[PDB]
Design a protein around this ligand. Structure first.
Ligand SMILES: O=P([O-])([O-])O[C@@H]1[C@H](O)[C@H](O)[C@@H](O)[C@H](O)[C@H]1O
Length: 494
């Protein structure tokens, strides 16, 4: 089966981060999208799952998600590997972790279990690793004895704002859940106004891909627990740190296929883990596009740092995915722009890639979280359409060439999930996707935001017309049906 989008992407990843192939990024064949029998699109795990309902009474999406996490951990034979933004899994996320582990222990297994959270230098951890570990041990009861725990919170750069934001649940290196959904009960489960988000479930070689990525982070985490300012670590039963748990489980055996889906796993190492890819010949000429709204105090890793690209292939992977679009691009994000300062306002290359698509007649849709949320980082969606216009002029010369590209090919709106502008409690809709879909053939579902950020993130890029059709039917088309009544007509357009 031809994967023309994956191929372009792979080309860029190999040119950017050749040494990181097979740890921080990897293409594999033979994957399956882990849908429950009789629910073929059930691999797409959206929360909360209430299109057409501003009241959101039946959070079916959220319970499919929690039940899929529970079931996947319940099936664990050897390893469970969890990462998220802080806090550690709480509320129903914790329940799914505990419940699954008890099942695994009942079926006679002794699972090893790693749990990694990123934390900003500003963020105060209420439940620190030793308290989290103790809490799980109590909740596990008699089964704790069979469960080897590694619990850790990490910050990799204080001055350059880098910590883990990957959101992974990998089991036995065989199944993986990932997306934008943090294990934070208060955004998703305990509220009259839940965040909207999406994860995907998968099984096969690409689950091992995620595993080796987490090994890369645990290698750094284990080594740097010698510096409590960066890492807080707690193990149970007197266990060592486990930097290579996914590798141990994999062994010499190559991962067995479980379906026919081609996938590119790709993440990034942020700042402070590795300076550069020593084997990389990446030699871009980086844009010089000083921005109206902002200058950066901090050194701009997004727009002006060759080395940062070499140890962060997800950045260029997202740029390649957009660049691969021959027909149309759908972007659904919390934000395109970052709040600047401190971070650069936007990723110049992304916007240039998008402007180039606008000028070639490729259709571009951008849905972002409602600016009535700053959970958002722009005052008005004109910020995005203005930026695209400046970059269009910077490309085509004259304005009404850009206006022809912009006004004819751009859909831009804030996210709605029902006909209601907001929820019952008056709070607006918060969108937390990190999703890109291209030509109804290839899509990214993961944790890497399109706005500038220097965290460790990870996600999957799938090339499957049948899966993208499902993605289009279950998420993109509904989103646009409701979000177009919050759409912007860019300034200077009919
Ligand atoms: O996208 P994410 O990594 O899960 O978390 C987001 C970022 O951490 C960002 O700092 C904040 O401004 C957003 O409000 C969060 O949603």
């Amino acid at each position: 089966p031809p994967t023309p989008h994956l191929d372009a992407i792979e080309r860029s990843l190999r040119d950017t981060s050749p040494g990181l192939e097979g740890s921080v990024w990897q293409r594999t064949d033979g994957n399956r999208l882990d849908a429950p029998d009789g629910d073929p699109a059930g691999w797409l795990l959206q929360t909360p799952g209430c299109w057409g309902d501003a009241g959101c009474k039946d959070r079916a999406g959220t319970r499919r998600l929690l039940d899929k996490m529970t079931r996947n951990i319940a099936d664990a034979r050897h390893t469970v590997d969890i990462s998220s933004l802080a806090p550690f899994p709480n509320g129903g996320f914790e329940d799914a972790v505990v419940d699954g582990l008890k099942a695994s222990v009942a079926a006679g297994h002794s699972p090893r279990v790693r749990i990694l959270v990123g934390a900003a230098p500003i963020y105060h951890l209420n439940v620190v690793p030793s308290r989290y570990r103790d809490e799980l041990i109590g909740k596990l009861g008699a089964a704790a004895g069979k469960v080897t725990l590694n619990v850790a919170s990490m910050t990799t750069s204080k001055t350059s704002l880098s910590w883990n934001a990957s959101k992974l649940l990998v089991v036995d290196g065989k199944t993986a859940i990932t997306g934008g959904i943090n294990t934070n009960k208060d955004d998703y489960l305990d509220t009259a106004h839940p965040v909207s988000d999406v994860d995907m479930a998968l099984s096969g070689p690409a689950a091992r891909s995620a595993g080796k990525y987490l090994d890369t982070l645990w290698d750094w985490t284990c080594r740097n627990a010698s510096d409590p300012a960066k890492v807080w670590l707690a193990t149970s039963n007197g266990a060592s740190c486990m930097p290579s748990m996914e590798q141990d489980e994999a062994g010499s055996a190559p991962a067995e296929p479980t379906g026919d889906v081609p996938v590119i796993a790709v993440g990034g190492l942020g700042v402070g883990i590795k300076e550069s890819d020593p084997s990389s010949g990446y030699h871009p000429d980086l844009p010089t596009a000083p921005d109206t709204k902002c200058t950066v105090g901090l050194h701009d890793n997004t727009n002006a740092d060759r080395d940062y690209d070499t140890v962060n292939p997800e950045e260029n992977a997202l740029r390649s995915l957009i660049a691969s679009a021959r027909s149309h691009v759908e972007i659904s994000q919390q934000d395109l722009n970052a709040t600047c300062p401190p971070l650069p306002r936007y990723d110049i290359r992304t916007y240039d890639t998008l402007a180039g698509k606008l000028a070639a007649g490729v259709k571009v849709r951008i849905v972002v979280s409602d600016p009535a949320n700053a959970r958002s980082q722009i005052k008005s969606l004109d910020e995005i359409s203005d930026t695209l216009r400046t970059r269009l002029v910077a490309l085509t010369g004259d304005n009404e060439k850009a206006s022809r590209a912009l006004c004819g090919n751009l859909q831009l709106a804030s996210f709605r999930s029902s006909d209601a502008a907001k929820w019952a409690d008056g709070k607006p809709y918060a969108l937390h996707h990190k999703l890109v879909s291209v030509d109804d053939s290839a899509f990214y579902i993961g944790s890497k935001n399109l706005y500038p950020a220097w965290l460790q993130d990870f996600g999957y890029i799938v090339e499957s017309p049948a899966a993208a059709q499902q993605l289009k039917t279950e998420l993109l088309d509904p989103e646009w049906k409701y979000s177009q009544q919050a759409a912007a007509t860019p300034a200077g357009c009919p």
